[PDB]
Amino acid sequence: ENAAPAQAPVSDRAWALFRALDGKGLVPDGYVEGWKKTFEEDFSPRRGAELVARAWTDPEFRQLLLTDGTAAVAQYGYLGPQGEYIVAVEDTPTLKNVIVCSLCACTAWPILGLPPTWYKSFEYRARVVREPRKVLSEMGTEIASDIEIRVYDTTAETRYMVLPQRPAGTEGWSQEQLQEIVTKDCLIGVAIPQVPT
């Protein structure tokens, strides 16, 4: 009949799992609370934005970020769980990069933040590998015909960030000013940094 299995409320199941483990001494004091804090406060696309703004204003760092992403990220102390081997991929006037995990949700957590619901969606996982131009267009990003789109499928341990092109009209901006226009979606590759009118 293709029907769903009967299930207790998900909150009840999730807390049951916690209580079953915690009741056996298997979860250290403050353990899940500590991870929650890390997930909410430390893992952040602000970190990736900082890296981009530095790369944009420092040719030496840009070169390091593109050749040894891990080393570059380590300078800021931003290595972490699901972000131990980093590769940054460079957008150019003829190339737009986009990241996905078609098999699940793999994402460079420490520098992009945990993946959002849309990135984990079956829609994004199925479609972006095959029709990235249409997907980006629907999301609000038009990529011209003479730009190649390259989709990176995060299938192993490499964790990716996009280094977008620096937009015109940002000449001489400070790192703080540049950081502001580099969003989570810019780092994933579905958005291009926007300069206010």
């Binding site: 250290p28 909410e40 081997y85 699940c104 619901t117 029709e131 341990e157």
Partner: protein
């Protein structure tokens, strides 16, 4: 495993539920949502009960209709719970007692996995490679769209990791391999039915062979 989780290239889905830079809300949209990852880390790092690869595989082992109607964080809760039961740490009875109702788990594995391949090749940037035309019923980190396809090496990793097809089953023979960023032309993967340029897949050495 040729499961429903191998979604790349599937046709018929609608719009991605996002427009660029739209508000995505808080990291967690419910008070339980930090639990799957934090309990996975307890299992991996504190208990040493399973690997992250085992978590990916147990989620792949969800009954297909169940997988398709379950949100991501819930799949993870189900996966971690299943692993805790399979490894003998918890019982399903105590989970359902604490939950106050049904707590169906992923299906048992139908494969014992496979070891890291004995015979592999160290590839160089610029080399042409073909993805081995192999079918693996257990865990594998090769999406089906690239099976048997030819591409070029863009990167060989400077680190090595256990072979997923082994460690995803908790085997002792996962060894270690580097992975390769293999660039495929869109037309190699989807013929005329793609609007893309290239796709780069991060493939373990043991999934590859020289082209020709």
């Amino acid at each position: 495993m040729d499961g429903v989780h191998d979604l790349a290239g599937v046709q018929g889905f609608g719009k991605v539920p996002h427009t660029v830079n739209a508000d995505i809300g808080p990291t967690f949209h419910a008070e339980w949502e930090h639990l799957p990852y934090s309990l996975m880390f307890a299992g991996v790092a504190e208990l040493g009960a399973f690997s992250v690869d085992e978590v990916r595989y147990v989620v792949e082992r969800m009954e297909p209709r169940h997988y398709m109607m379950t949100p991501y964080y819930e799949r993870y809760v189900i996966g971690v719970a299943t692993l805790m039961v399979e490894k003998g740490i918890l019982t399903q009875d105590e989970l359902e007692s604490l939950a106050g109702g049904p707590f169906p788990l992923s299906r048992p594995s139908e494969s014992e996995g496979r070891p890291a391949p004995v015979e592999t090749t160290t590839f160089e940037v610029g080399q042409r490679v073909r993805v081995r035309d192999e079918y693996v019923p257990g865990h594998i980190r090769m999406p089906a769209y690239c099976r048997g396809r030819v591409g070029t090496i863009s990167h060989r990793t400077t680190e090595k990791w256990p072979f997923p097809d082994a460690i995803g089953h908790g085997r002792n023979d996962a060894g270690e391999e580097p992975t390769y960023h293999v660039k495929f032309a869109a037309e190699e993967l989807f013929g005329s039915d793609t609007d893309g340029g290239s796709v780069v897949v991060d493939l373990f050495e043991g999934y590859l062979e020289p082209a020709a």
